[PDB]
Amino acid sequence: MKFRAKIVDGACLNHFTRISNMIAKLAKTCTLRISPDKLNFILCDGGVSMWCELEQENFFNEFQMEGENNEIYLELTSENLSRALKTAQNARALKIKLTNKHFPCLTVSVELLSMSSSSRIVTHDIPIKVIPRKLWKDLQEPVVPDPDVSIYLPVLKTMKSVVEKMKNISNHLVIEANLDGELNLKIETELVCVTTHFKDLGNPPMAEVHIDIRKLLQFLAGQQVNPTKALCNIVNNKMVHFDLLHEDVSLQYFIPAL
Amino acid sequence: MKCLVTGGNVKVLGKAVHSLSRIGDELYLEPLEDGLSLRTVNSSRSAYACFLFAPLFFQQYQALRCKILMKSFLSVFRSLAMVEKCCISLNGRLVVQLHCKFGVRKTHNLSFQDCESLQAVFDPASCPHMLRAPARVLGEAVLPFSPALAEVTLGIGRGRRVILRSYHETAKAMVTEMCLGEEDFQQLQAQEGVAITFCLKEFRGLLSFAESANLNLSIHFDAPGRPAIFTIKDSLLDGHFVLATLSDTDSGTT
Amino acid sequence: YSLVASLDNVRNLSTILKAIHFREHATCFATKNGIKVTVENAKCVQANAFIQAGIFQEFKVQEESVTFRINLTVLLDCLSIFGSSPMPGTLTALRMCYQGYGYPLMLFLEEGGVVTVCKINTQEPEETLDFDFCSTNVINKIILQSEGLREAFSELDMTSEVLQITMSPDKPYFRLSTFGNAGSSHLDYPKDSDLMEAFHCNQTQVNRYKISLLKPSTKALVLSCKVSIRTDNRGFLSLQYMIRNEDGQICFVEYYCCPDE
Numbered sequence: 001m002k003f004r005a006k007i008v009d010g011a012c013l014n015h016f017t018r019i020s021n022m023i024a025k026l027a028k029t030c031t032l033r034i035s036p037d038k039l040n041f042i043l044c045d046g047g048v049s050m051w052c053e054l055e056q057e058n059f060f061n062e063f064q065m066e067g068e069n070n071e072i073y074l075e076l077t078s079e080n081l082s083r084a085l086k087t088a089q090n091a092r093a094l095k096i097k098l099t100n101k102h103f104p105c106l107t108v109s110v111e112l113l114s115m116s117s118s119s120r121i122v123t124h125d126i127p128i129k130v131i132p133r134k135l136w137k138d139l140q141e142p143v144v145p146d147p148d149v150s151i152y153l154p155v156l157k158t159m160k161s162v163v164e165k166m167k168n169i170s171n172h173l174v175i176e177a178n179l180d181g182e183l184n185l186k187i188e189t190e191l192v193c194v195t196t197h198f199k200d201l202g203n204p205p206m207a208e209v210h211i212d213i214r215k216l217l218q219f220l221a222g223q224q225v226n227p228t229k230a231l232c233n234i235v236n237n238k239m240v241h242f243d244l245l246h247e248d249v250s251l252q253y254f255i256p257a258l
Numbered sequence: 259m260k261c262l263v264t265g266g267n268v269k270v271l272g273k274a275v276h277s278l279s280r281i282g283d284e285l286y287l288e289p290l291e292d293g294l295s296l297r298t299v300n301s302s303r304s305a306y307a308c309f310l311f312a313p314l315f316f317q318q319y320q321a322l323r324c325k326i327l328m329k330s331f332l333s334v335f336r337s338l339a340m341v342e343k344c345c346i347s348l349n350g351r352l353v354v355q356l357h358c359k360f361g362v363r364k365t366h367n368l369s370f371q372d373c374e375s376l377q378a379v380f381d382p383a384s385c386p387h388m389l390r391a392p393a394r395v396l397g398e399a400v401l402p403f404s405p406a407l408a409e410v411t412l413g414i415g416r417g418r419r420v421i422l423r424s425y426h427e428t429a430k431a432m433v434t435e436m437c438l439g440e441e442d443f444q445q446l447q448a449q450e451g452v453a454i455t456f457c458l459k460e461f462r463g464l465l466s467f468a469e470s471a472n473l474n475l476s477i478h479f480d481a482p483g484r485p486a487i488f489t490i491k492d493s494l495l496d497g498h499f500v501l502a503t504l505s506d507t508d509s510g511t512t
Numbered sequence: 513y514s515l516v517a518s519l520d521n522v523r524n525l526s527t528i529l530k531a532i533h534f535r536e537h538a539t540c541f542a543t544k545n546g547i548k549v550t551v552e553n554a555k556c557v558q559a560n561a562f563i564q565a566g567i568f569q570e571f572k573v574q575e576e577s578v579t580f581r582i583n584l585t586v587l588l589d590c591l592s593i594f595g596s597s598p599m600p601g602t603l604t605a606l607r608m609c610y611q612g613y614g615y616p617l618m619l620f621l622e623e624g625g626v627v628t629v630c631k632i633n634t635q636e637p638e639e640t641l642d643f644d645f646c647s648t649n650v651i652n653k654i655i656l657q658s659e660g661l662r663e664a665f666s667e668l669d670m671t672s673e674v675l676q677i678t679m680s681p682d683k684p685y686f687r688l689s690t691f692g693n694a695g696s697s698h699l700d701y702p703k704d705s706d707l708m709e710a711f712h713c714n715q716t717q718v719n720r721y722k723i724s725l726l727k728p729s730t731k732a733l734v735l736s737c738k739v740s741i742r743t744d745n746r747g748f749l750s751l752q753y754m755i756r757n758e759d760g761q762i763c764f765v766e767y768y769c770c771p772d773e
Contacts, residue, residue, distance in 0.1 A: 083404060084432070116439065118439025122402040125433040161593070162628070191586075192632050193630070194628065194630050196627075196628040197628065198626055333694065336667070360707045361700075361705045362699065362700065363702075366695070367696040367697070367698075368694060368695045369694075
């Protein structure tokens with residue numbers, strides 16, 4: 001197995017860190033799929049699943065890997081990566097490279113520049129867990145069938161504030177979406193009932209779900225900026241699929257019910 | 259005792275007390291002919307620190323050593339000194355009076371336990387290895403490490419360059435390693451290959467105080483086992499830390 | 513109907529309530545003058561929040577006086593449901609409705625077109641003590657600024673099961689004291705201080721109130737501009753806070769507390 005990436009562009013470097021901070025809040029342990037074309041953060045279990053598409057040729061300046069089957073499935077703790085990328089903010093260059101000194105790791109070498117002529121270097125050895133070809137099939141992108149309703153999602157900031165306050169009421173939550181772009185958030189206890197009504201949400205090309213508010217709140221927390229694409233695909237049965245595409249980074253989130 | 263700390267020196271005293279908090283749970287006081295000595299010791303007797311305050315104000319004694327709960331004396335400086343004057347005297351009870359603004363006064367009657375002094379065997383001049391660099395630099399050298407990191411190893415790699423490496427005792431942990439050039443140091447007198455391991459959380463306590471004062475910190479270490487000696491000196495301020503170093507069979511006890 | 517209260521700025525209601533939020537539940541008392549929410553604890557402390565009908569953009573009370581106990585926590589969560597960080601320009605509208613008895617309290621909020629409807633059930637066991645704190649039998653009275661007391665109450669909390677308040681025309685003009693494990697800490701307030709607006713101390717008085725009962729006062733202290741610390745013959749304490757709305761109109765919040773024998 002081979003893997004050597006390298007980032008130099010500031011905008012990309014910082015933006016890459018943002019992505020790690022996000023996934024660190026959506027999953028304690030994730031799976032990193034290394035493809036010659038793109039990178040992916042995957043996980044599946046509460047049976048929530050996450051799929052993060054990332055165009056490699058849009059972040060790194062130098063990139064190369066080796067699988068016949070050019071592809072690598074690594075299992076790492078999200079926290080370890082984020083902390084490793086935290087010091088790469090005011091950094092000059094970033095070099096992530098698959099290693100195996102003491103044990104299979106993902107070395108994240110960082111070059112920090114300063115008023116000193118001598119270059120500062122910080123290396124992180126992220127413990128890795130290579131997944132056999134046997135499970136390669138169970139870590140593929142989740143399937144999005146025929147959404148009973150496909151409505152555009154309101155500003156996440158507002159939706160988040162509402163979910164926050166509703167969590168202090170009940171652990172359950174009913175999300176409803178119509179055709180005239182009407183998204184509703186309903187919580188009901190034997191003492192207090194709260195219902196929020198959104199309207200005018202497009203959906204060019206009713207469905208209720210009883211998911212727990214605790215996991216819905218997790219999804220809205222990871223987002224620190226308004227996505228350039230917010231779709232809420234609902235299946236009246238027991239599924240809520242969120243499709244985001246901020247810039248060139250795709251994010252798919254799935255939340256079951258019952 | 260008769261102390262009258264004013265101006266920025268008040269905050270400096272506070273910062274000093276805060277540093278002695280991240281190492282010990284009891285503050286040892288001891289007025290001397292050269293200044294005010296604030297000392298402390300680790301619960302496991304594997305760490306010691308001391309701040310000598312040569313006339314940073316208006317000192318005077320007799321008309322005296324003692325010991326208070328570090329956290330009690332800390333609450334007085336936690337945010338209360340956020341204060342133009344500070345009088346530390348003795349009644350009867352360590353009295354710490356704060357002459358705040360608008361006229362508001364904050365007197366502190368702190369009970370304590372009169373005991374003996376805290377001596378300890380050091381010898382930086384006899385310490386084989388040595389290095390000296392701006393605190394600001396060392397503070398940057400520890401940034402890559404997690405705040406929860408307990409132990410870190412300071413070593414000298416081939417090429418005359420210092421290297422801080424994370425220490426740990428199939429859930430493998432991430433090993434962080436910071437490497438600094440010789441040019442970052444004002445002095446580097448250490449043998450290549452030699453490396454010691456000490457407490458980071460305690461080392462930060464001193465480093466945080468040396469940074470805010472913009473001062474230079476010098477480390478004196480020997481062989482794995484014998485304590486490491488950290489030193490900082492100011493125009494009218496003195497302080498030094500001493501931490502235990504791991505070994506082979508032992509578990510870092512001194 | 514029975515009780516309708518429109519409001520263009522929910523904060524005119526939610527903000528003042530937060531200063532009385534040291535208990536899960538609260539009693540509401542609405543007349544023609546306005547609304548009055550009261551929260552008490554240990555039957556030794558009581559916080560009163562008054563909101564004259566002048567503040568509202570549409571107040572209405574049917575027949576006599578309407579009362580109902582309710583969950584303050586849930587209420588506050590509902591009011592600030594659209595987040596508690598709106599920037600200068602955005603406002604949330606409120607319409608409160610309560611139908612006498614057996615009916616739940618209705619809340620209607622809206623921001624940027626987004627409307628939310630809350631249904632909080634009313635639960636009225638009540639039983640509320642009456643502090644006979646009259647002005648006719650007041651010994652000492654002091655009116656200082658709220659900023660100065662910020663660092664006071666905040667860093668005040670100790671292992672001390674009490675807070676000694678002493679007001680006197682002599683040496684210690686106004687001293688707050690505590691006595692815990694650490695020892696004893698005193699906080700003085702010299703007369704003729706710019707922090708001191710009014711000063712009317714007839715005779716030296718020393719009272720001790722369970723500090724755990726005056727701590728929640730900060731919710732109003734940091735929220736007010738002025739505070740009228742008052743003490744009567746029985747030893748009861750009276751903390752009166754001036755809280756100005758985001759429209760300018762002033763409001764009141766009063767804390768009562770029994771001494772410690």
